[PDB]
């Protein structure tokens, strides 16, 4: 049996092509994606949902974002920048980053691939628990902008986990394969992959000729994703609360967290309905907060950010030396591509062109990885 694994920055997903169709595999908690989190405690190692669940209790020994570090030098602009944010310790070990933690009350250091190997071990165990069989062969995906060092460190994470990594493949390629864009007969095709998640935005242009892939260009925005849209809603409701109640909830971390969680959920509701309601009892100083927001209001609050997703697209076309009319296929991946306005801005930018969007955009990378794993098996 062979599996496809989307090893993601914040979440991972595993699929298997069996009985003629890809099955995305649920973890032990029933979830079709698993937090790329690892926690060290007094008694044990936790990976996935259990590790993410206890972040608040144990934030210094709970590791995430290992993908931002894997295969980079300690003095990489990316490692340097991110460190100041992470509550866990990142140590300098002869120019290479290691994460340092307490584990069963003893201090231990791990290389990024060691942490990612623990996430992969979990994804392997997830597939094994479902299939009721040992699972060894995997395809694992990486961003198209990953260099040789990052790709090799990713492969090594797999090997440490006991996987036979059949192939490391680019995320945008796996997404194309999922849609069978390489099965299309004709001449050379230009494919745009538009990948918008909770924190990051990647655009990639590939050419496919005769089932054969090439990466033409990459672009994106490091600081744009669904969290940014939530924040615009948060600020909208904090201002509303001040206007009606003349009280400032912004210094109360628990009130703002309740509001923020409600906003993220209302956002998801606005992708399928044109309005969303919220009722939070006793939000701040005993005051109830009952409110609603329309899809149009949500769109207006994010109008600059949404239109802004077209700049990397233009960038990617310039770098690929292509005209927007020379794009044959557009594929949406990432959970934030479910936003109707984003799909409309993009469908308009390409003068009314259809979008490949029917596969769950959180699962599409794993889905292509699983198809290719069964092919290579």
């Amino acid at each position: 049996p062979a599996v496809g694994i989307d090893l993601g920055t914040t979440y991972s997903c595993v699929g298997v092509f069996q009985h003629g169709k890809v099955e995305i595999i649920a973890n032990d908690q029933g979830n079709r994606t698993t937090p790329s989190y690892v926690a060290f405690t007094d008694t044990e190692r936790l990976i996935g949902d259990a590790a993410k669940n206890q972040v608040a209790m144990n934030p210094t020994n709970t590791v995430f974002d290992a993908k931002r570090l894997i295969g980079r030098r300690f003095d990489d602009a990316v490692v340097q920048s991110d460190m100041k944010h992470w509550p866990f310790m990142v140590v300098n070990d002869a120019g290479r980053p290691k994460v340092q933690v307490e584990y069963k009350g003893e201090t231990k250091s791990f290389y990024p691939e060691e942490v990612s190997s623990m996430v992969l071990t979990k994804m392997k165990e997830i597939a094994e628990a479902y299939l009721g069989k040992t699972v060894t062969n995997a395809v694992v995906t990486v961003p198209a902008y990953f260099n040789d060092s990052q790709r090799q460190a990713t492969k090594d994470a797999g090997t440490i986990a006991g996987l036979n990594v059949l192939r490391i493949i680019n995320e945008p390629t796996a997404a194309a394969i999922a849609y069978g864009l390489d099965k299309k007969v004709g001449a050379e095709r230009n494919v745009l992959i538009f990948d918008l998640g909770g924190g990051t935005f990647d655009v990639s242009i590939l050419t496919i000729e005769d089932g054969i892939f090439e990466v033409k260009s990459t672009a994106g925005d490091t600081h744009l994703g669904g969290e940014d849209f939530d924040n615009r809603m948060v600020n909208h409701f904090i201002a509303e609360f001040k206007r009606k109640h003349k009280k400032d909830i912004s210094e109360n971390k628990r009130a703002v967290r309740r509001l923020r969680t409600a906003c993220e959920r209302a956002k998801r509701t606005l992708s399928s309905s044109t309005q969303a309601s919220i009722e939070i009892d006793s939000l701040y100083e005993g005051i109830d907060f009952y409110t609603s927001i329309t899809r149009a209001r949500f769109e207006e609050l994010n109008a600059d950010l949404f239109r802004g997703t077209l700049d990397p697209v233009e960038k990617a076309l310039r770098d690929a030396k292509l005209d927007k009319s020379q794009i044959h296929d557009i594929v949406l991946v990432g959970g934030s591509t479910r936003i109707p306005k984003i799909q409309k801005l993009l469908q308009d930018f390409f003068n009314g062109k259809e979008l490949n969007k029917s596969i769950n955009p959180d699962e599409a990378v794993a889905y292509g990885a699983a198809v290719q794993a069964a092919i290579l098996s």
Binding site: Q54, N58, R257, T261, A262, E279, D281, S282, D288
Partner: protein, 111 residues
């Protein structure tokens, strides 16, 4: 006015009320250990160690209460669902009272 649908909301709320009791009990267990620990039996360094393990536990209790509030915050109750509305408000206030209790402990130990 009582409607079959309010039964569904009332059942959800009762299940949350039981969860809150489970967490409140963890807080009571925590507090009982705290008194024993502080009652000075261990060397001061080992006492501090024990108080920090307890601090980590009160943080788990706070987070469990926060998760309950987030679940309660997903409910939408019509004005006419008076019983459900009263039970929702009453449960939120209870949880907030228990959070005040956690904060007292949290902000006394393992400073």
């Amino acid at each position: 006015g009582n409607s079959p649908q309010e039964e569904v909301e009332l059942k959800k709320l009762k299940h949350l009320e039981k969860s809150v009791e489970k967490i409140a009990d963890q807080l009571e267990e925590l507090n009982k250990e705290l008194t024993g620990i502080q009652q000075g039996f261990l060397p001061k360094d080992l006492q501090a160690e024990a108080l920090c393990k307890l601090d980590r536990r009160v943080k788990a209790t706070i987070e469990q209460f926060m998760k309950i509030l987030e679940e309660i915050d997903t409910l939408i109750l019509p004005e006419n669902f008076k019983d459900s509305r009263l039970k929702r408000k009453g449960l939120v206030k209870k949880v907030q009272a228990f959070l005040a209790e956690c904060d007292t402990v949290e902000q006394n130990i393992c400073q």
